[PDB]
C-alpha cells in the first residue's frame, strides 16, 4: 500500500528514492499508482504557457504558472527559457555566432561538464537534410560540433531494443528486450510496449547508464518520462534539475521525444506534413539551449543528439499475408509487421509442423516480400539468435512491405526492417567541451555510444558488445587508451618430420612480410596450430581442429588467374611438416555421400604450376557442402580477382567458424556438433573472408603508406541454397546477392573465431578499432 495523503509540496520531481509506504512525486509515480494527491495539481502546472511575453516581465510572482518571468526567477532556476530573450534584451542560441569550445565554461561548482542525451524516435538520418530552413537549432548544433552521417541502429529497427541498446552497449539478444512485444515461455508472460508487465525488472539485462553511473557515485537524473508530461516540462525539469545545490546536482540527464515517429508512421517520411513535427522538436532544442544559457551552461554540458531508427514508406496495399502461403494460420501467432517472429498459438503445441511451414514460406512467389529465416541461419551482422525471447522460425521483411497474419490507410510509415536498409538509419549529434568542433566522422552503430557515454562522465563501462576506443575519434578529450590483448597461444613453425610413404590418407594426386601484410593474427584461446609458410599463402593450421583457423594470401591487381587441369581434379596431397595423425583424410569425404571440399587458398591463384601443387595441400583443405562449393568456388575463381582488380590488389584472410550454439562466439570443442562422415573433421557453421587493401586505391596494398580499406563476410555453410531463390540460374546471377546480405565486421570475426587482426600496422590502434567495427553495406 502506499499513503496518497501526503503531499509533493516542495517536492516537485525529487531525485531521492521514495518507496512505499509513502508516496511519489516523480516520472515513475502514476505507472505505479503512488503519486501523492497533489501531484498533478503542484508538480504539473500549465497556466499561461511556456513562453515570456513582454507583458510579463517583472510580474510578481504566482505560483500558479507554469514557469515565471519575474525577476526573482534565474536565482529560483524557474524561468521560462525565453525570459532573457524577451525581458532582458538577450539573443536566442541558436542566433549566436559557432564558437569552438575548447575546454568547458562552467559555473563555480561544476566539477566536471553534464551530459545531456537528447533522443528522439523515429528521427530518420535523411531527415538532417532539411537544414536550417526547418531545423536551426539542430543545424547549428550539427553543423558546429561533431556529427556522423548517420548512425546505425540495431535489429529489429523498433524502439524499445533500441533505446534499451542505447543505454547498455549491448544487442537486443543479450540485453533481452528482443522486440517491443515478446513472449517469454520460461515465464510464460508477455511483455508489450503498452501495459504494465514491462515494468517487471525480471525482463531488462546488462546494466544501464544510469545504473552505471549510480554505482559510480555519478548523479542521474530521471531517464524515463510518463506520457502526460508534455516536453516543456520536461525541459523545465532538466533546467530545474541543472540549478540545483552542488550537492543535489545530477551529471547526467535524459530527455525523449516521441516525435517525429509518431507524425512519420501517419504521414510517411516524405509526406509534407513532416515539416510541421520537425520544427516542434527543432523548437524544444531551442528551448533547451536558450534555457543552458540563461544558466551560463551553453559551453558547459555536453549534448547527444540521437535517434533510435528511422521510417520507411510502408502503407496497407503492401501487406504480405501468411494464410496465402499456409493453410490454419489461426493455429499460429505472428509477431508481425516489419518483421516476423512465429510461434504456436497454444505455447508447446505439439502439432506445430516448423519444418511445414518453413517450407510453405519458402521461395514461392516470384516477388515475394519476406524471406523465413530460422534464427541460427539470420545474418551474423544482426546477432539476433541467443535469446529464448526470439521464437526458431523468423521472417525477414523486404523494405517498404509489412507481414500479416491473414486479411481478417490510416499509416504510411513504419520501421522495423533489417538494420543495414538506408531508410532504418539514424541520427548522431555530439556538441560540447568534449566533442570535436566542426567535425565529421563515418557512421558507426549505436551499440558503440554506451562506452563514450561513460567516457564522457569519467565511469567504467560495464562488460558490452561496443569496441571501446573505436570513437575515440568523436572526442576532443576523455578518449579511451586501448591496449592490444595478449596472444594467449604462439605457434609452432614445424619443419619436415615426414615422408610421402608415411601417410594413409586415402588421397591420391596425379612470405610473411608478403602474405601478412598486418601482421599474423594473435590466438586469444589456449589451443595448439601450426605456422604454415607456402609461396603464394600462409596459414595458422590448427592441430585439434585439423584445418587452418586462418589462410591469409595477398593478391596484386595484375595477378593472373590459372585454371585447374582435369588431371589435378581430385589432386589432394599430404602436408609433411604436419603429422598424419594432425590431418584430414580424404577417404572421409569419398565416402560422405552429402559432403565434399574446398580450399582457403584457391588453386586459381597460384604463382606458378609447381606452387600450384601447394594449394592441393591437405592442409589448404576444408570441408564443404557442394552447395556451398557453388559459391565458394565463384567466389574463389571470380570474385577475389574482381576486388584485386578494383580495388589495386587485395590481401585475403579466410577461415573457418564454429558456432553451433548460435552465441555469435568461438565454440569450444564440446560444443561442435558435426564432423565429415566416419570421421572428426568438425564441419564450420560459417566460413569468412577479410579482405583489406589501401584506402587510397592509387597506391597498391603492399605498398599502402595511409588507411586501410576492408569489407568482410561471414557466408552461412549450408547443405541446400534454399535461401538464394534464384540459385538455379548461373552464379553470376545470385551468389553476390548472398554475399552481400551476409557482410560482417572484422570485429564479428574476432569474436566468433577468438583471433586478433590488425596488430602490425603504421596505424593508432584507436583507427584500427574504427577499421574493425566498420560494416561495408552495400546500400
Ligand atoms: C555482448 O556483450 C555481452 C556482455 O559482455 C556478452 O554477454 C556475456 O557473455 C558471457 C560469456 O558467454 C556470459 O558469461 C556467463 O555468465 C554467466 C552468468 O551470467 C549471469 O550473471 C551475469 C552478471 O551479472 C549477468 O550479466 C547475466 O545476465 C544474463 O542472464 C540474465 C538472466 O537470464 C538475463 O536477464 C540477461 O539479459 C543476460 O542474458 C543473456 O546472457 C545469457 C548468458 O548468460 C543468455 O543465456 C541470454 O540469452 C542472454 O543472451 C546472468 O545473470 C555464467 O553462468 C557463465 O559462467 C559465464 O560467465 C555473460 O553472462 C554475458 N552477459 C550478458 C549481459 O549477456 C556477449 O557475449 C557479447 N556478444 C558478442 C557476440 O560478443
Ligand atoms: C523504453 C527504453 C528504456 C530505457 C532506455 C532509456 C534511455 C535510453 C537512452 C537515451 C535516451 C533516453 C531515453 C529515455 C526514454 C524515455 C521514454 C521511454 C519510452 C517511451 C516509449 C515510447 O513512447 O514509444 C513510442 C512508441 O511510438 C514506439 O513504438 P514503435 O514506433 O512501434 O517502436
Ligand atoms: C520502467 C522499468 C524500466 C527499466 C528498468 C531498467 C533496468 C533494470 C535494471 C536492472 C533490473 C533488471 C533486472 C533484470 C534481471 C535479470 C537479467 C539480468
Ligand atoms: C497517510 O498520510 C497522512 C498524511 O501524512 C497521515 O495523516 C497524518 O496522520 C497522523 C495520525 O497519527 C496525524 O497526526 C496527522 O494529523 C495526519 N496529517 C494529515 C495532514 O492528515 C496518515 O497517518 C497516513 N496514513 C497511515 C500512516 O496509515
Ligand atoms: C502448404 O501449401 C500446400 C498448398 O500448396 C497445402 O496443401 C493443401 O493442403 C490441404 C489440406 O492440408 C489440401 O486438401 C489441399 O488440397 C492442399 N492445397 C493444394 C493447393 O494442393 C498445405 O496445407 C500447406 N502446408 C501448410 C503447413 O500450411
Ligand atoms: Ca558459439
Ligand atoms: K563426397
Ligand atoms: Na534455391
Ligand atoms: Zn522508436
Ligand atoms: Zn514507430
Not at 541520427?427 to 570535436?436: A, D, L, N, R, S
Not at 590418407?505 to 609458410?533: F, K, M, N, Q, W
Not at 559459391?631 to 576486388?643: D, G, I
Not at 590481401?651 to 569450444?668: A, H, K, Q, T, W
Amino acid at each position: 500500500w502506499t499513503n496518497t495523503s501526503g503531499s509533493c509540496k516542495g517536492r516537485c520531481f525529487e531525485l531521492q528514492e521514495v518507496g512505499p509506504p509513502d508516496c511519489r512525486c516523480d516520472n515513475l509515480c502514476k505507472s505505479y499508482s503512488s503519486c501523492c494527491h497533489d501531484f498533478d495539481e503542484l508538480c504539473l502546472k500549465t497556466a499561461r504557457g511556456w513562453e515570456c511575453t513582454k507583458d510579463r516581465c517583472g510580474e510578481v510572482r504566482n505560483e500558479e504558472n507554469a514557469c515565471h518571468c519575474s525577476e526573482d526567477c534565474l536565482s529560483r532556476g524557474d524561468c521560462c527559457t525565453n525570459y532573457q530573450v524577451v525581458c532582458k534584451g538577450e539573443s536566442h542560441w541558436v542566433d549566436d555566432d559557432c564558437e569552438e569550445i575548447r575546454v568547458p565554461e562552467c559555473p563555480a561548482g561544476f566539477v566536471r561538464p553534464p551530459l545531456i542525451i537528447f533522443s528522439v524516435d523515429g528521427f530518420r538520418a535523411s531527415y538532417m537534410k532539411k537544414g536550417s530552413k526547418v531545423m536551426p537549432n539542430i543545424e547549428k548544433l550539427r553543423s558546429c560540433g561533431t556529427h556522423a552521417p548517420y548512425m546505425r541502429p540495431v535489429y529489429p529497427t523498433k524502439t524499445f531494443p533500441n533505446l534499451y541498446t542505447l543505454a547498455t552497449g549491448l544487442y537486443p539478444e543479450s540485453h533481452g528486450i528482443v522486440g517491443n512485444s515478446m513472449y517469454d515461455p520460461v515465464f510464460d508472460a508477455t511483455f508489450h510496449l503498452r501495459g504494465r508487465e514491462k515494468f517487471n525488472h525480471r525482463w531488462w539485462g546488462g546494466q544501464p547508464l544510469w545504473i552505471t553511473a549510480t554505482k559510480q557515485g555519478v548523479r542521474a537524473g530521471t531517464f524515463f518520462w510518463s506520457v502526460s508530461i508534455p516536453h516543456e516540462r520536461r525541459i523545465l525539469t532538466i533546467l530545474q534539475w541543472l540549478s540545483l545545490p552542488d550537492n543535489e546536482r545530477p551529471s547526467v540527464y535524459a530527455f525523449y521525444s516521441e516525435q517525429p515517429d509518431f507524425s512519420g508512421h501517419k504521414y510517411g517520411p516524405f509526406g509534407p506534413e513532416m515539416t510541421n513535427p520537425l520544427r516542434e522538436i527543432d523548437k524544444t532544442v531551442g528551448q533547451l539551449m536558450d534555457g543552458l544559457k540563461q544558466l551560463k551552461l551553453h559551453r558547459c554540458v555536453n549534448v547527444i543528439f540521437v535517434g533510435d531508427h528511422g521510417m520507411e514508406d510502408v502503407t496497407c496495399d503492401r501487406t504480405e499475408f501468411l494464410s496465402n502461403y499456409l493453410t490454419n494460420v489461426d493455429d499460429i501467432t505472428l509477431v508481425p509487421g516489419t518483421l516476423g517472429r512465429i510461434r504456436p498459438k497454444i505455447p508447446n503445441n505439439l502439432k506445430y509442423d516448423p519444418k511445414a511451414i518453413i517450407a510453405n514460406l519458402t521461395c514461392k512467389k516470384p516477388d515475394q516480400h519476406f524471406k523465413p529465416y530460422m534464427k541460427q541461419h539470420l545474418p551474423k551482422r544482426l546477432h539476433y539468435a541467443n535469446n529464448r525471447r526470439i521464437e526458431d522460425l523468423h521472417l525477414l521483411v523486404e523494405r517498404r512491405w509489412h507481414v500479416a497474419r491473414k486479411p481478417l490507410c490510416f499509416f504510411q510509415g513504419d520501421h522495423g526492417f533489417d538494420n543495414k536498409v538506408n531508410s532504418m538509419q539514424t541520427v548522431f549529434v555530439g556538441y560540447g567541451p568534449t566533442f570535436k568542433y566542426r567535425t565529421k566522422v563515418p557512421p558507426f552503430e549505436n551499440i558503440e555510444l554506451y562506452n563514450v557515454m561513460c567516457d564522457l562522465l569519467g565511469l567504467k563501462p560495464a562488460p558490452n558488445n561496443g569496441t571501446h576506443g573505436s570513437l575515440n575519434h568523436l572526442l576532443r578529450t576523455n578518449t579511451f587508451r586501448p591496449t592490444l590483448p595478449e596472444e594467449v597461444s604462439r605457434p609452432n613453425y614445424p619443419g619436415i618430420m615426414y615422408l610421402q610413404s608415411d601417410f594413409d590418407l586415402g588421397c591420391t594426386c596425379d612470405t610473411e612480410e608478403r602474405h601478412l601484410l598486418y601482421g599474423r593474427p594473435a590466438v586469444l584461446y589456449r589451443t595448439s596450430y601450426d605456422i604454415l609458410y607456402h609461396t603464394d599463402f600462409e596459414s595458422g593450421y590448427s592441430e585439434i581442429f585439423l584445418m587452418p583457423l586462418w589462410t591469409s594470401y595477398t593478391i596484386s591487381k595484375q595477378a593472373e588467374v590459372s585454371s585447374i587441369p582435369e588431371h589435378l581434379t581430385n589432386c589432394v596431397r599430404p602436408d609433411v611438416r604436419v603429422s598424419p595423425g594432425f590431418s584430414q583424410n580424404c577417404l572421409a569425404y569419398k565416402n560422405d555421400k552429402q559432403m565434399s571440399y574446398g580450399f582457403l587458398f584457391p588453386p586459381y591463384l597460384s604463382s606458378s604450376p609447381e606452387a600450384k601443387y601447394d594449394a592441393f595441400l591437405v592442409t589448404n583443405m576444408v570441408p564443404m557442402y557442394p552447395a556451398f562449393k557453388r559459391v565458394w568456388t565463384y567466389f574463389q575463381r571470380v570474385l577475389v580477382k574482381k576486388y584485386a582488380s578494383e580495388r589495386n590488389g587485395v590481401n585475403v584472410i579466410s577461415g573457418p567458424i564454429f558456432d553451433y550454439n548460435y552465441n555469435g562466439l568461438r565454440d569450444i570443442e564440446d560444443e561442435i556438433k558435426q564432423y565429415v562422415e566416419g570421421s572428426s573433421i568438425p564441419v564450420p557453421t560459417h566460413y569468412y573472408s577479410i579482405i583489406t587493401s589501401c584506402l587510397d586505391f592509387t597506391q597498391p596494398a603492399d605498398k599502402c603508406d595511409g588507411p586501410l580499406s576492408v569489407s568482410s563476410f561471414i557466408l552461412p555453410h549450408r547443405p541446400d541454397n534454399d535461401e538464394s531463390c534464384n540459385s538455379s540460374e548461373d552464379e553470376s546471377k545470385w551468389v553476390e546477392e548472398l554475399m552481400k546480405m551476409h557482410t560482417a565486421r572484422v570485429r564479428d570475426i574476432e569474436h566468433l573465431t577468438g583471433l586478433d587482426f590488425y596488430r602490425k600496422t603504421s596505424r593508432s590502434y584507436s583507427e584500427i578499432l574504427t577499421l574493425k567495427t566498420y560494416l561495408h553495406t552495400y546500400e
